[PDB]
Amino acid sequence: MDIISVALKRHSTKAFDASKKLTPEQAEQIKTLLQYSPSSTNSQPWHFIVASTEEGKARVAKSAAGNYVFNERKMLDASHVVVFCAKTAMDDVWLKLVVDQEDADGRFATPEAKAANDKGRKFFADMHRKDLHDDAEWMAKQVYLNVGNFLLGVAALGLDAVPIEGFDAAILDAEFGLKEKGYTSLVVVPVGHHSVEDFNATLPKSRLPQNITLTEV
Amino acid sequence: MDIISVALKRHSTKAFDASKKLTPEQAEQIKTLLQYSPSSTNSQPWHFIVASTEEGKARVAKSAAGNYVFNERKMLDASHVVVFCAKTAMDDVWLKLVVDQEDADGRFATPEAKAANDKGRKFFADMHRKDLHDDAEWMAKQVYLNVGNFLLGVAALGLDAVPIEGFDAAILDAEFGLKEKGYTSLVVVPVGHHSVEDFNATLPKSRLPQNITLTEV
Numbered sequence: 001m002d003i004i005s006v007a008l009k010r011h012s013t014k015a016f017d018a019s020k021k022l023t024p025e026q027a028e029q030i031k032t033l034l035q036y037s038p039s040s041t042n043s044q045p046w047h048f049i050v051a052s053t054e055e056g057k058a059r060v061a062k063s064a065a066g067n068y069v070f071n072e073r074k075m076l077d078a079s080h081v082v083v084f085c086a087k088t089a090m091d092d093v094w095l096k097l098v099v100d101q102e103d104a105d106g107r108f109a110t111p112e113a114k115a116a117n118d119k120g121r122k123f124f125a126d127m128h129r130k131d132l133h134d135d136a137e138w139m140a141k142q143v144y145l146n147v148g149n150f151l152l153g154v155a156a157l158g159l160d161a162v163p164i165e166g167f168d169a170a171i172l173d174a175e176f177g178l179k180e181k182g183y184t185s186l187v188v189v190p191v192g193h194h195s196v197e198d199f200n201a202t203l204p205k206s207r208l209p210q211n212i213t214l215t216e217v
Numbered sequence: 218m219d220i221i222s223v224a225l226k227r228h229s230t231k232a233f234d235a236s237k238k239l240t241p242e243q244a245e246q247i248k249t250l251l252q253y254s255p256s257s258t259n260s261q262p263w264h265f266i267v268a269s270t271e272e273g274k275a276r277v278a279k280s281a282a283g284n285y286v287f288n289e290r291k292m293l294d295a296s297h298v299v300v301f302c303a304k305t306a307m308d309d310v311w312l313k314l315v316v317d318q319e320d321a322d323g324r325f326a327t328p329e330a331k332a333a334n335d336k337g338r339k340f341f342a343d344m345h346r347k348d349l350h351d352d353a354e355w356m357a358k359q360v361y362l363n364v365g366n367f368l369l370g371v372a373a374l375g376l377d378a379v380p381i382e383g384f385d386a387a388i389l390d391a392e393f394g395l396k397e398k399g400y401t402s403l404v405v406v407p408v409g410h411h412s413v414e415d416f417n418a419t420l421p422k423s424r425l426p427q428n429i430t431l432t433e434v
């Protein structure tokens with residue numbers, strides 16, 4: 001139909017044209033994309049840093065050191081740069097915040113309904129932080145789902161981007177003081193327009209055949 | 218077709234209409250989306266099981282026989298049900314398949330480039346299994362990214378879907394021989410059309426305000 005073309009044509013830009021900026025509306029749309037992404041129990045265990053100024057992107061680019069210098073240009077030449085972050089721990093106060101927000105949005109017809117939603121999220125949140133002891137990983141997964149949504153989304157807006165795992169999270173967390181605020185940086189995504197130097201823009205996309213990765217029953 | 222419109226209008230279907238099946242074109246499109254999703258170093262550490270037959274969907278819904286009974290109707294009433302599986306461990310045979318497929322796809326100009334690509338992927342793959350000891354979680358994250366991409370894609374195709382974490386992965390894994398093949402189920406996503414008995418379709422969307430989850434610099 002339409003998004004299939006977007007999916008088959010989008011790519012990880014290797015070089016950005018620093019002079020091509022997102023339009024005022026697009027800048028707002030990418031923020032909307034970030035927030036409306038789904039998440040288990042609507043937990044939204046994330047926080048985003050959107051860098052659009054030269055100074056802002058420079059602070060983000062501090063994480064592209066060591067063996068990650070190959071990603072410095074991308075972080076500095078893109079119009080906007082999104083740092084996706086996950087909570088370091090699922091706290092009850094935040095869980096309450098999530099339910100109160102759903103209540104204010106008119107999702108609960110009765111107080112019994114709200115209580116039943118708190119319970120549902122509670123069991124899930126408990127299963128991960130008290131029994132499986134993988135709450136940090138559970139929350140990180142939701143941030144990655146968000147990234148997936150975000151990448152196809154910006155591509156559908158006619159925007160170029162690249163997901164980056166090659167950066168120093170310790171350096172980034174310290175630069176923005178995320179540790180104390182209760183967050184950790186996971187993926188950095190510069191968004192804008194590719195430049196003529198983006199050799200990946202003209203290369204064919206490559207994926208494993210479906211006979212290997214897919215099973216139909 | 219505005220992508221922001223689909224993001225704001227999409228929702229998690231709580232009940233599907235068994236008579237409304239995907240068209241052959243949509244069934245093909247769904248597989249294209251799963252296959253073309255991006256991933257760290259094009260690792261594609263996943264496997265998908267697509268159940269379109271009533272007997273196939275029945276087997277999947279067996280994982281919701283415990284305290285997840287409420288989720289059983291979703292896996293059976295939906296046209297197609299996709300379970301996203303992550304590799305349990307990153308073997309050198311898989312790293313070989315990916316770089317060979319890329320070579321076959323013409324992404325490498327010379328034999329040295331192919332080598333450098335394989336070196337960069339191994340660098341990242343080694344750091345996760347040898348140093349951080351989190352390859353299982355790193356691969357699970359890629360699978361979640363695929364889910365994010367997927368949910369948006371089907372929504373944009375005009376299809377209803379719902380991501381499900383409420384299922385027993387141990388039962389599902391044993392039902393489809395997983396674990397032996399080197400995979401583990403993570404998310405189940407039934408795709409199709411919602412029925413008039415879907416309350417979430419009329420209900421408003423709820424997300425935390427940007428003043429809490431987003432910071433601009």
Ligand SMILES: Cc1cc2nc3c(=O)[nH]c(=O)nc-3n(C[C@H](O)[C@H](O)[C@H](O)COP(=O)(O)O)c2cc1C
Nearest residue numbers: 038039040041042145227228229379380381382383
């Ligand atoms: C990874 C994941 C797991 C989910 N598991 C379930 C589930 O077991 N049952 C269900 O009804 N909804 C499930 N959901 C749906 C969420 O509650 C939903 O995404 C969230 O409330 C936001 O609503 P929306 O998807 O309509 O935007 C899941 C969502 C995600 C992302």
Ligand SMILES: Cc1cc2nc3c(=O)[nH]c(=O)nc-3n(C[C@H](O)[C@H](O)[C@H](O)COP(=O)(O)O)c2cc1C
Nearest residue numbers: 010011012071163164165166205255256257258259
């Ligand atoms: C989570 C994640 C991390 C990535 N990290 C980097 C990175 O640090 N630098 C880079 O240039 N590409 C990076 N990529 C790009 C991938 O190699 C790319 O998604 C993959 O080769 C498939 O190509 P495509 O995105 O053009 O379809 C990353 C991709 C993902 C999904």
Ligand SMILES: NC(=O)c1cc(N(CCCl)CCCl)c([N+](=O)[O-])cc1[N+](=O)[O-]
Nearest residue numbers: 040041042116117119120121124287383
């Ligand atoms: N897996 C969860 O426990 C969960 C539970 C519920 N319900 C609430 C009562 Cl426990 C049960 C019927 Cl599904 C819903 N829900 O509302 O549809 C969604 C999720 N969810 O994950 O997002």
Ligand SMILES: NC(=O)c1cc(N(CCCl)CCCl)c([N+](=O)[O-])cc1[N+](=O)[O-]
Nearest residue numbers: 014015069070071073166200258334337
């Ligand atoms: N050959 C590729 O297209 C490729 C190139 C690069 N770089 C060049 C662009 Cl500036 C780094 C070398 Cl400095 C990166 N990357 O940023 O790491 C990843 C991939 N990749 O697919 O793996």
